[PDB]
């Protein structure tokens, strides 16, 4: 003793953390998003797939499905900020909704519990869908940025 | 805003049309000026030929070669002054100069194909009326450009093998008009002009 040795040998204590002041509050969304809206999913497996906003979850998430009969769009979580909320509006008068939460999507192929909930929810949507015109079609078709397209304009 | 871009020099202003195309460039905008022999410039014909006159004497003493080459050929010219504004002597340069072609008269792979203008660089909106101006056409001649009349023949041509493209694109589009009012009062066409259209 290549090397000597210090006098000071640090502490091996690990600290506690300071009492802190950050309370989690409830997300205030942008105002366009009302249950009954078509969205446009800007990313993911379904980038561009026009979809229907059903419920606001607690994890801030959006519970949406297209009508699975339409368009391939199951009941699914989706993030506010990867989504364009448009004008159009179904009514979403008749949908259960209240069974859906954060525990329902717990990655704890397919489930038939989840398959049945798709049919029930869709039959109430499809009904308020067949109200308007060509809407069934607008939900099927994928949205896109054509030639001379200007989002900025393009009032969604 | 496209992959290519076919400008027609005519009614231009070397000078200005000049830039824009160098700017562009440095921003990935393959461009292809044509026609040119019909460029244009501020100033009474005379000059410029005076102007020209110099960038001519400027040589290299000791070997007239290896020195500043004085092209004649409208093309080349435009070029140059284009150029001057694109830092060549680097790579980004060059990678610039490629993007740009140039011919006097619209040859083929363009006579097709559409072309455009560059307003902000049109005589006819820069100048004030009364001021004399040029025509790279003459200029080039005059400082020796064997070929102006061989262009000016292949012009007489294609101003036709065009027109007769025309009086044919136009007797078409017109029937489409006398066969486009039969079907439109149709149902489809009133909802339409409510959304617009």
């Amino acid at each position: 003793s290549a090397q000597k040795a210090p006098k000071w040998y640090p502490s091996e204590d690990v600290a506690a953390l300071k009492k802190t002041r950050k309370a989690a509050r409830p997300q205030k969304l942008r105002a366009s998003l009302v249950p009954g809206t078509v969205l446009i999913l800007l990313a993911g497996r379904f980038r561009g797939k026009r979809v229907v906003y059903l419920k606001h979850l607690e994890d801030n998430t959006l519970l949406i499905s297209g009508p699975f009969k339409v368009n391939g769009v199951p009941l699914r979580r989706v993030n506010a900020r990867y989504v364009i909320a448009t004008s159009t509006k179904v009514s979403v008068e008749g949908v259960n909704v209240e069974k859906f939460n954060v525990e329902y999507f717990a990655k704890e192929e397919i489930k038939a519990e989840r398959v049945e909930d798709q049919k029930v929810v869709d039959k109430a949507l499809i009904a308020e869908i067949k109200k308007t015109p060509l809407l069934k079609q607008y939900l099927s078709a994928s949205f896109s940025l054509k030639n001379g397209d200007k989002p900025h304009m393009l009032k969604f | 805003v496209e992959p290519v871009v076919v400008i027609d020099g005519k009614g231009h202003l070397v000078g200005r049309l000049a830039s824009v195309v160098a700017k562009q460039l440095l921003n990935g905008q393959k461009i292809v000026v044509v026609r040119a022999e019909e460029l244009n410039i501020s100033g009474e014909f005379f000059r410029n030929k005076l102007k020209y006159h110099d960038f001519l004497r400027k040589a290299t003493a000791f070997n007239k070669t290896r020195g500043p080459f004085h092209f004649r050929a409208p093309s080349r010219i435009f070029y140059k002054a284009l150029r001057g504004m694109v830092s060549h002597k680097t790579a980004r340069g060059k990678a610039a100069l490629e993007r740009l072609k140039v011919f006097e008269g619209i040859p083929p792979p363009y006579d097709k194909k559409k072309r455009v203008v560059v307003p902000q660089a049109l005589r006819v909106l820069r100048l004030k009326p009364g001021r004399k101006y040029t025509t790279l056409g003459k200029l080039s001649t005059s400082v020796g450009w064997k070929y102006e009349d061989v262009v000016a023949k292949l012009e007489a041509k294609r101003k036709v093998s065009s027109a007769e493209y025309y009086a044919k694109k136009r007797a078409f589009t017109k029937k489409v008009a006398s066969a486009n009012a039969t079907a439109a009062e149709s149902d489809v066409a009133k909802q339409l002009a409510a959304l617009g259209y």
Partner: protein, 106 residues
């Protein structure tokens, strides 16, 4: 359809630079179309991605990305500024550029 694109087309012009000293950290955006500082205001915050192609495949792809975003109006034109995780590479002055539409607000 034939179109898929649910990005805005647009180009890598520059470094911020003074007449003779440049700053690789900031980059400049030619959003194809956008002509004013307003038109740019829309694309602050929206993400970017110089995509390109290496020869030797990683990671399972031939294709790579650098994740912008757009951060402010640059002067009159709705050129805009545009930190990226990594600084764009210069060879890129004139390369195509995917402004996206997320961190959305519509």
């Amino acid at each position: 359809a034939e179109s898929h694109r649910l990005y805005v087309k647009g180009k890598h012009l520059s470094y911020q630079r003074s007449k003779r000293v440049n700053n690789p950290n900031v980059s400049l955006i030619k959003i194809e179309g956008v002509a004013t500082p307003q038109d740019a205001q829309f694309y602050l915050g929206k993400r970017i991605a110089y995509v390109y192609r290496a020869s030797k495949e990683v990671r399972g792809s031939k294709i790579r990305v650098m994740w912008g975003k757009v951060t402010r109006t640059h002067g009159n034109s709705g050129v805009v500024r545009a930190t990226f995780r990594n600084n764009l590479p210069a060879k890129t002055f004139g390369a195509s550029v995917r402004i996206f539409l997320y961190p959305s607000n519509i």
